[PDB]
Amino acid sequence: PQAKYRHDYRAPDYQITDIDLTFDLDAQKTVVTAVSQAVRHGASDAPLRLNGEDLKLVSVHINDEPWTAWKEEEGALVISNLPERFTLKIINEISPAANTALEGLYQSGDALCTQCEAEGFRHITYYLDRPDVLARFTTKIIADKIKYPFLLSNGNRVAQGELENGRHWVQWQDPFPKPCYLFALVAGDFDVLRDTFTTRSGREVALELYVDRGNLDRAPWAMTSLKNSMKWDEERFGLEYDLDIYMIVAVDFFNMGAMENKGLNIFNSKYVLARTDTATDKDYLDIERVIGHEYFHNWTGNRVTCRDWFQLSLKEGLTVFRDQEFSSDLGSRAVNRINNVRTMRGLQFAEDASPMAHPIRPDMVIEMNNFYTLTVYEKGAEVIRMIHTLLGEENFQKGMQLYFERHDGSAATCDDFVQAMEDASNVDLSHFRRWYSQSGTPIVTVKDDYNPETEQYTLTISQRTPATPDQAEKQPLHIPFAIELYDNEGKVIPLQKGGHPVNSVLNVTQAEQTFVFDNVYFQPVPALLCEFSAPVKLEYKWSDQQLTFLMRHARNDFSRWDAAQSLLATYIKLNVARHQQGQPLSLPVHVADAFRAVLLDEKIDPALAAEILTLPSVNEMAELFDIIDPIAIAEVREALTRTLATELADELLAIYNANYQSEYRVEHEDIAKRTLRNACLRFLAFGETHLADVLVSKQFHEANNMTDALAALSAAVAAQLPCRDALMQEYDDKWHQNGLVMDKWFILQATSPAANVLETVRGLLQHRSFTMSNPNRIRSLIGAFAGSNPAAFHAEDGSGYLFLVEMLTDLNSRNPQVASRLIEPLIRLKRYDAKRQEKMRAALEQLKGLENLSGDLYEKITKALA
Ligand SMILES: CN(C)c1ncnc2c1ncn2[C@@H]1O[C@H](CO)[C@@H](N)[C@H]1O
Ligand SMILES: [Zn+2]
Numbered sequence: 001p002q003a004k005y006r007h008d009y010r011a012p013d014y015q016i017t018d019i020d021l022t023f024d025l026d027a028q029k030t031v032v033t034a035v036s037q038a039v040r041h042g043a044s045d046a047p048l049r050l051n052g053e054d055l056k057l058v059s060v061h062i063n064d065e066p067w068t069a070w071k072e073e074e075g076a077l078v079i080s081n082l083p084e085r086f087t088l089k090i091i092n093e094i095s096p097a098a099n100t101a102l103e104g105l106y107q108s109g110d111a112l113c114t115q116c117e118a119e120g121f122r123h124i125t126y127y128l129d130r131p132d133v134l135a136r137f138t139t140k141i142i143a144d145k146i147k148y149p150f151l152l153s154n155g156n157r158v159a160q161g162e163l164e165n166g167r168h169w170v171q172w173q174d175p176f177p178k179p180c181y182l183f184a185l186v187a188g189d190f191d192v193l194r195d196t197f198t199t200r201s202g203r204e205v206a207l208e209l210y211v212d213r214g215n216l217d218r219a220p221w222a223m224t225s226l227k228n229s230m231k232w233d234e235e236r237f238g239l240e241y242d243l244d245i246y247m248i249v250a251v252d253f254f255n256m257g258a259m260e261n262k263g264l265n266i267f268n269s270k271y272v273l274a275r276t277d278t279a280t281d282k283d284y285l286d287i288e289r290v291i292g293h294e295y296f297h298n299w300t301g302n303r304v305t306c307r308d309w310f311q312l313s314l315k316e317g318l319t320v321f322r323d324q325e326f327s328s329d330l331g332s333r334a335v336n337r338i339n340n341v342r343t344m345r346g347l348q349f350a351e352d353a354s355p356m357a358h359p360i361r362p363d364m365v366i367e368m369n370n371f372y373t374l375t376v377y378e379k380g381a382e383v384i385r386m387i388h389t390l391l392g393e394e395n396f397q398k399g400m401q402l403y404f405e406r407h408d409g410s411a412a413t414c415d416d417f418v419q420a421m422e423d424a425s426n427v428d429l430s431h432f433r434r435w436y437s438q439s440g441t442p443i444v445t446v447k448d449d450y451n452p453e454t455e456q457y458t459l460t461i462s463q464r465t466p467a468t469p470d471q472a473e474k475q476p477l478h479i480p481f482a483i484e485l486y487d488n489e490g491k492v493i494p495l496q497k498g499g500h501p502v503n504s505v506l507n508v509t510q511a512e513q514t515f516v517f518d519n520v521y522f523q524p525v526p527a528l529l530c531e532f533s534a535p536v537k538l539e540y541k542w543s544d545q546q547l548t549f550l551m552r553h554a555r556n557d558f559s560r561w562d563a564a565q566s567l568l569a570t571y572i573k574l575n576v577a578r579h580q581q582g583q584p585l586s587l588p589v590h591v592a593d594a595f596r597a598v599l600l601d602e603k604i605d606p607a608l609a610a611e612i613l614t615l616p617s618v619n620e621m622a623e624l625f626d627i628i629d630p631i632a633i634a635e636v637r638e639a640l641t642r643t644l645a646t647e648l649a650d651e652l653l654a655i656y657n658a659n660y661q662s663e664y665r666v667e668h669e670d671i672a673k674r675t676l677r678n679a680c681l682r683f684l685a686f687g688e689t690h691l692a693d694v695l696v697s698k699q700f701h702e703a704n705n706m707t708d709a710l711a712a713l714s715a716a717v718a719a720q721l722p723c724r725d726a727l728m729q730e731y732d733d734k735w736h737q738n739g740l741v742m743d744k745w746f747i748l749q750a751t752s753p754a755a756n757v758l759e760t761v762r763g764l765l766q767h768r769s770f771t772m773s774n775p776n777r778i779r780s781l782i783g784a785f786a787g788s789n790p791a792a793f794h795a796e797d798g799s800g801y802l803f804l805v806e807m808l809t810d811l812n813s814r815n816p817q818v819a820s821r822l823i824e825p826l827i828r829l830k831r832y833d834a835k836r837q838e839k840m841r842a843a844l845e846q847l848k849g850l851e852n853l854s855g856d857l858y859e860k861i862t863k864a865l866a
Contacts, residue, residue, distance in 0.1 A: 001855035006310040013042030051122035058091040108253035111188030121180035131179035148187040184261030218273035260297030317380020334557035346620035355863035366859040395425035445539040457520040479508035482530035490553035607672035634791035678711035685715035742769040743780035750784035816854035
């Protein structure tokens with residue numbers, strides 16, 4: 001499989017302007033007729049090169065003449081000797097029932113549905129399957145009326161009919177030109193939740209959420225969230241929906257999350273279906289996020305699309321930024337920022353230190369489905385956020401507005417977007433552009449000096465990015481470095497120099513620089529990289545007391561949390577080293593006291609307290625180390641929990657009880673109280689065994705919502721409480737028929753600290769609720785084991801690696817996209833000790849040798865073994 005390169009982009013030799021599709025739908029044999037209107041832009045002698053995969057070609061006509069000047073080649077239909085302008089007619093057959101990869105037209109249960117991003121449309125017909133070819137679609141769908149009463153495509157219905165032999169048809173037209181990755185088709189029998197949204201200018205939009213029969217009870221929150229998304233995009237960004245109908249279809253079989261097909265989004269049901277007994281607060285807020293995200297793409301992705309796939313972050317960085325801003329405005333901004341930074345530092349930085357490292361605008365791709373990454377998405381969004389930091393809201397929105405004025409109805413590049421921001425704001429983003437081309441995490445080192453003679457405070461700030469596997473050369477970035485200086489009372493010291501204010505966002509643009517501040521009347525405590533102002537590792541020699549000072553006094557809630565993270569990091573590192581020498585946890589009294597103070601502080605937001613009382617995950621902890629010792633990290637996390645449980649027992653139980661809520665509401669203040677209560681319950685579970693067992697079992701049985709029930713169940717498994725096996729069986733007996741609810745239970749099984757977790761997981765391959773045909777079940781059992789139980793995955797006997805190789809050997813053939821997601825923990829081998837590296841390398845070597853190795857896995861495996 002051959003790599004493609006960004007620098008190789010060239011405008012297409014032919015465009016398509018209009019495509020009329022007819023589907024004669026059948027799960028075993030679907031016939032596609034595609035009539036395209038084409039224009040040659042390149043040389044007269046250049047053939048038309050159409051992409052296609054696993055298609056049975058029936059016929060090729062050019063202006064209704066059966067064509068003889070063509071050939072099929074791997075992946076392609078090459079058509080020669082064409083006029084400058086012509087009508088192409090292709091007829092071909094495809095087989096949805098055989099499509100286990102879930103790419104193209106496939107079956108989800110009894111429904112037929114599509115996934116076309118990135119390159120799935122070529123699995124449906126021969127086409128210019130590249131996102132700089134925009135065309136107007138018309139789609140006619142013919143099917144059995146009893147099996148497929150609903151026949152959906154993008155846009156509005158223009159024609160409908162009934163045929164003999166129980167077939168019917170519907171034809172759709174979408175006026176907006178689109179690249180083919182935004183094509184969608186759905187056929188099936190559904191319950192339908194119908195609502196309306198009226199835009200601020202008065203356009204009434206019909207909203208339609210399509211769910212499997214008997215799931216309407218789980219649909220209102222998704223609808224609520226759609227309307228919220230629409231309203232917010234109007235309020236914040238000034239953008240209105242542009243069509244008459246907005247359709248969402250929830251399907252159970254889906255490799256991604258959800259997909260922004262124009263006017264006909266297709267969602268994994270995990271990101272739609274919720275009711276209070278089936279879904280947690282986090283589920284509710286994730287549905288809100290993903291509903292938002294796909295809606296937001298209607299502008300950032302659909303009305304302006306991507307010139308080529310290397311520009312994916314153009315839509316994904318900006319749409320994730322928008323989803324974050326949406327959640328943050330509606331909810332707790334600080335809890336959002338905290339959890340997005342946890343993702344960045346715990347998951348994204350690992351990718352940027354791995355063999356799959358890439359810039360947010362990649363330069364080299366083998367399989368584009370491998371580049372829907374933490375980097376492109378979440379780091380992408382941090383890059384957008386940095387532009388927002390540099391410009392301010394008002395200039396940022398002027399940039400947005402210039403971007404749409406210039407590029408609406410076209411396919412654009414990341415550079416176009418930056419230029420629009422630069423030109424609208426008059427802020428120079430030339431250096432800033434290097435964030436798009438350079439991979440890896442910058443390390444920002446900060447030293448400080450306070451001169452009492454002159455009342456000056458000096459920060460000496462250096463940067464460097466280490467080389468990564470993909471790039472041997474690195475250069476300094478334009479790093480927006482936000483600070484705040486605090487006096488001995490906790491009050492912010494005004495920043496100034498030579499009699500003038502200085503902006504608190506420092507422009508860290510060199511390898512080394514100094515910043516001098518005047519009229520600093522007291523030695524300050526600095527808050528550095530405020531709100532995570534750039535996606536970098538910060539090196540500052542913090543005292544413990546500077547960090548507890550910030551926890552008490554810092555103005556922004558994020559800074560209070562971040563200071564707690566910096567204080568814990570020192571002691572996580574200390575205790576991992578101790579664990580490797582067989583020595584028990586050591587924690588200063590003053591550290592425990594800082595967490596006690598947070599528990600008893602009446603003035604702190606409970607949302608913030610809960611996050612400070614949520615220890616860094618085993619992933620966030622791994623980021624603190626060059627070489628990862630996953631057993632030490634897991635055991636240190638447990639011991640730290642037990643230590644705090646003991647030291648803070650009385651305070652934890654008081655706050656647990658104080659935050660009891662008898663009514664359940666999906667409302668942010670309520671959520672905050674509940675997160676705090678369950679944060680306390682986690683520590684209590686790791687306390688004295690009898691009290692723990694009582695508290696946890698009672699919460700599980702008495703809960704009136706899934707948040708509380710699952711928090712108890714997860715604590716029983718994490719602390720290996722007596723009640724665990726009863727409660728787990730209880731859950732299975734109640735919920736086994738409900739795959740989305742059972743996913744939570746598979747995750748708890750896979751992430752268990754029990755010694756026999758792998759045996760349990762293997763046995764669960766045969767569980768009544770598990771199936772290898774469903775990506776959500778696969779992720780929830782196998783994925784969670786490999787990725788979220790690094791202590792068991794990395795068992796010294798190598799059993800974890802062997803288990804993953806077995807599963808990958810199936811999935812490589814069945815569903816390469818899911819396989820490539822699941823191989824990630826093995827490609828991290830260079831972070832582990834030699835003995836583990838040797839076992840992981842052997843596992844990788846085994847997979848490299850598979851018959852019919854997918855491109856998706858080939859790419860990762862070859863990088864890993866280099
Ligand atoms: C370790 N890997 C592959 C991932 N770990 C966690 N989240 C991921 C990962 N790969 C992609 N994502 C998320 O998928 C979403 C897009 O499908 C992005 N939001 C990205 O974070
Ligand atoms: Zn997206």
